[PDB]
Amino acid sequence: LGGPSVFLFPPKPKDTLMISRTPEVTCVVVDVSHEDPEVKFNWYVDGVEVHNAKTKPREEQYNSTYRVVSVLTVLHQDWLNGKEYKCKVSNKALPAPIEKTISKAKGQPREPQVYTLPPSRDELTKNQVSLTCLVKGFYPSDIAVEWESNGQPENNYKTTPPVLDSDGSFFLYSKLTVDKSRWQQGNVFSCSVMHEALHNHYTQKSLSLS
Amino acid sequence: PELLGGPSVFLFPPKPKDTLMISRTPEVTCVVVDVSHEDPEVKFNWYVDGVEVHNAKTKPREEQYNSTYRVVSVLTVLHQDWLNGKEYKCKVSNKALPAPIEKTISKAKGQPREPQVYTLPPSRDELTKNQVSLTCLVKGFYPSDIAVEWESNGQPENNYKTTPPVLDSDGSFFLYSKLTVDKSRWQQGNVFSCSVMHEALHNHYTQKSLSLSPGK
Amino acid sequence: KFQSVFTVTRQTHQPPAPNSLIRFNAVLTNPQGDYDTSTGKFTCKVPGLYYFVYHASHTANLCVLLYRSGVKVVTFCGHTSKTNQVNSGGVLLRLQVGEEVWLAVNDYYDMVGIQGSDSVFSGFLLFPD
Amino acid sequence: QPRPAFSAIRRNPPMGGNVVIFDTVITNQEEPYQNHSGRFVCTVPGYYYFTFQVLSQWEICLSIVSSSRGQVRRSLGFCDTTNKGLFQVVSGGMVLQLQQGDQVWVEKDPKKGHIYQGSEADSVFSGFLIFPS
Amino acid sequence: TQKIAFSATRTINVPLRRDQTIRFDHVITNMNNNYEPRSGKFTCKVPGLYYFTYHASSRGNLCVNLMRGRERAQKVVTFCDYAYNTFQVTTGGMVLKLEQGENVFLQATDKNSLLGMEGANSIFSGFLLFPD
């Protein structure tokens, strides 16, 4: 190998939108020889070097190599404003250090439409029904969808991944599963969506019987 | 270069629709790379459940960026064979290779699980737009190989996109297909239907319709 | 016995069939009957650490593969044109009662040694348990 | 307990005859191996493993031979007939059940007995007890 | 009751440099864990008699030095086996009396044609014959 390999990952979308979470870009170096496991990390925010990063203890890989990870916390606003994050990896086995940079996607942000759809009449014969949340017209594809009720987070739901639509934006569906009982009882459910292009980055759409 | 246990082999299965829909013939591909220029000659062998067959066809060789070749042998297999779980094998041997590389391929088995199809009309809120979304929910199926199509008045709709299969809480898959149509067509009472083709369906085919409530 | 040892040889002018198990039909030593010449397989009676080694004569390409209970453990290949060479291989394995060990060939199956060059497969228990 | 085991190599071997003499001892626990004759002598009855890795540049055929009550017992042969003037290692080995007094040694075919003589690389003859009788 | 044995193959896809200590990274067996899978050296815990052996696949000329020693290693023997435009499998072996703390390993030479892969293996093994 031309020495180690670097992979720079973006922050968890949820982390970037809540004040109580701390977003971080992650730099992962794989295939770090047992011969030379020492690795040096250099981070840069728009060019300026930063020293707040933190490296984790190396991890022994099953195929006799090392994995070294460096974590750089970032400021919510820095990230959403498009600041570039550069990770510079150095190893004795590396002819020249490897550099990787990432930033939030640029293209026109497009605000998502949220639509809740009740169970199909046919499904109402089953014990569990499907509540559906259609989310479409958004860009970037980074988004977070959740379901809640009575101010509490639901458990049983899966969301499809973002999917490219005909006009260049994305859509996805989230499916909540609940006992036909709860639906019949008239309980109200909400589909929560967090996307940068939404007013205040958050919107909800309720769903219930009748 | 020259630091490999000879060239390497990778096999690929036919495309889902091809295996389900008849309009297309099944095709199992066997690709080869890292074929040094010192020994470009490559030969393939095909074994169906052990029983050899030569009805295969080999496409010409091409050159790679770092001095390697890309030889491919496409054995158009059969629907019955594949769907039954017929095990296929592509054995390749090269002089620059120490041992004859051979790989096997076959349909992903499993309970099968019968898919439930549900059509869902546009949300009231979307009705203010010029185009609306007709949704088709397909859940409970296994394996993931499936086909979803939309039609109206005997003709196939164009404008629709289906999410990829998504693993559900219980091991089955579910997906959603979104058909976009002008609000007018929806209100004119046209009837739309979602066709699903899957192995665990009676006759491997099912349909669900969707149209504006009686009214107009 | 409470021990296990064998040295078998292949006495035939015809090589093995391609992609098949290598049968050693003749016995030099095999007191416990651990190696079965009828199936060409060694079957563990006494659990423990074993050493397996072979020296196979060939006058064309030959790859010998050692299998343990259905799993290919090691493969060694020797290439030759018309002249005679010896393909060798070996491995230490900690076996359990009932486990099978055997040698096989792939598309390179030649074991036609010249007059005076033979093929042998040996195995023996080192540490009981 | 018995620990008969040896490994001997070639460096300054007396030539002559078809017996291959490994004159330089690396290991010889209980001195079973005679570096002057190339013969191993069994003291402890039992099953032994013997093996050789010999260097040749032309044509060589070797066999592990034994004797019991002075009676010679010919066995398997192992050859390398590449004959290109380049290093080739011929190897061979087997388990032998020996009785007290039996002798084991490597013999070369008189018509194909070329063994490398030099300091570039080595030829070895090894043997050890597997278990006593 | 000292059951010591190891068998390790080389799967790392990187050439061998002259005087470099062979590293058989893949362990099949390592009873008493006296062999270092990561590296490629055996280190004697229990002194006594051991048998060491290897089978190396190769695509060209190959020479290997069998090494022994404590803080300073020395060479017992050198095994060479040549191949001209062809593939080969070669072997070497040695019985060595070992003292506690001594390590045994294979060291590459100027002839480093050694293959370590699926279908063309290179293995290094060792086992205790009799404890001192």
Task: List the one residue out of C7, C9, C97 whose CA is nearest residue C45.
Answer: C97
What residues make up the domain containing A21? 5-102
C29-C32-C36-C41 Cα dihedral, nearest 10 degrees:
-100
Helix residue ranges per DSSP H, chain A? 13-17, 76-80, 180-184
Distances in whole angstroms, Cα of residue C46 to Cα of each of B67, B86, E8: 53, 40, 24
Indicate whether A78 and A117 sit together in one domain: no
B119: distance to nearest CA of chain A, Å?
Answer: 6
In a domain? residue A126: yes
Query: Are residues B4 and E118, on separate chains, in Cβ contact within 8 Å?
Result: no
d(CA B159, CA C30): 75
Q: Is D57 annotated as a binding residue?
A: no
Looking at B50, B78, B105, the residue that finishes a domain is: B105
**Chain B partners of C63 at a C-beta cutoff of 8 Å?**
98-99
Which of A 48-67 lie inside 8 A of E, CB atoms? 63-64
Query: Are residues B5 and E120, on separate chains, in Cβ contact within 8 Å?
Result: yes
Q: How far is CA C74 from the centre of its chain?
A: 12
In a domain? residue B16: yes
Indicate whether A119 and A168 sit together in one domain: yes
What backbone torsions phi and psi does residue A175 show, to the nearest 5 degrees?
-120, 120
**Chain D partners of C5 at a C-beta cutoff of 8 Å?**
47, 95, 130-131
Query: Are residues C87 and E89, on separate chains, in Cβ contact within 8 Å?
Result: yes
Query: Are residues B174 and A158, on separate chains, in Cβ contact within 8 Å?
Result: yes
Beta-carbon contacts of B124 under 8 Å, excluding residues fewer than 6 positions away, are none
Rg (CA), chain B: 23
- Total domain count, chain A: 2
C96: distance to nearest CA of chain D, Å?
Answer: 20
In a domain? residue A152: yes
In a domain? residue A176: yes
For residue C66, the SS3 value is strand
Query: Are residues C77 and B100, on separate chains, in Cβ contact within 8 Å?
Result: no
Interface of D with E (CB under 8 A): 1-3, 5-7, 9, 26-27, 29, 51, 53, 55, 84, 86-89, 91, 120-122, 124, 126-129
DSSP state of B51: E
Nearest to E93 among D3, D53, D129 (CB): D53
- Resolution of this deposited model, Å: 10.0
CATH code for the domain of A167: 2.60.40.10
**Chain B partners of A164 at a C-beta cutoff of 8 Å?**
161
**Chain B partners of A175 at a C-beta cutoff of 8 Å?**
137, 139, 174, 176
Query: Are residues E49 and D89, on separate chains, in Cβ contact within 8 Å?
Result: no
Query: Are residues A64 and E12, on separate chains, in Cβ contact within 8 Å?
Result: yes
CATH code for the domain of E6: 2.60.120.40
d(CA B46, CA B74): 10
Q: Search chain E and give the residue with CA nearest C126.
A: E129
Task: List the one residue out of C23, A164, A190, E75 whose CA is nearest residue B160.
Answer: A164
A99 close to A182: Cβ distance less than 8 angstroms: no
Task: List the one residue out of E70, E60, E47 whose CA is nearest residue E111.
Answer: E60
What residues make up the domain containing E60? 1-132
Indicate whether A86 and A133 sit together in one domain: no
Contact C/A (≥3 CB pairs under 8 Å): no
Chains that touch B (3 or more CB pairs under 8 A): A, C, E
The per-residue b/e assignment along D36-52, b for 16 or more CB within 10 angstroms, e otherwise, is: eebbbbbebbbbbbbbb
C51 close to E28: Cβ distance less than 8 angstroms: no
- Total domain count, chain E: 1
Distances in whole angstroms, Cα of residue E33 to Cα of each of A117, E41, E99: 61, 11, 17
Beta-carbon contacts of A114 under 8 Å, excluding residues fewer than 6 positions away, are A133, A134, A135, A191, A193, A203, A204, A205
Indicate whether B81 and B32 sit together in one domain: yes
* Interface size, chain B vs chain E, as Cβ–Cβ contacts under 8 Å: 22
Task: List the one residue out of C110, B139, E49 whose CA is nearest residue A173.
Answer: B139
For residue C104, the SS3 value is strand
CB of E92 within 8 Å of a chain D CB? The answer is yes
Indicate whether B98 and B148 sit together in one domain: no
Indicate whether A60 and A142 sit together in one domain: no
> Long-range contacts for B202-210 (Cβ within 8 Å, ≥24 apart)?
B204/B20, B206/B115, B206/B117, B207/B117, B208/A122, B208/B117, B208/B118, B208/B119, B208/B136, B209/B119, B210/B119, B210/B120, B210/B121, B210/B134, B210/B136
Q: Report all structural domains of chain C as residue ranges with CATH numbers, in order of start.
A: 1-129 (2.60.120.40)
Task: List the one residue out of A88, A56, A63, A59 whose CA is nearest residue A1.
Answer: A63
- The method recorded for this entry reads cryo-EM
Indicate whether B135 and B204 sit together in one domain: yes
d(CA D107, CA D66): 10
Structure token pair of residue B53: 């067959």
Indicate whether B28 and B94 sit together in one domain: yes
Nearest to C77 among B91, B93, B98 (CB): B98
In a domain? residue A83: yes
Q: Report all structural domains of chain D as residue ranges with CATH numbers, in order of start.
A: 1-133 (2.60.120.40)
**Chain D partners of E81 at a C-beta cutoff of 8 Å?**
87-89
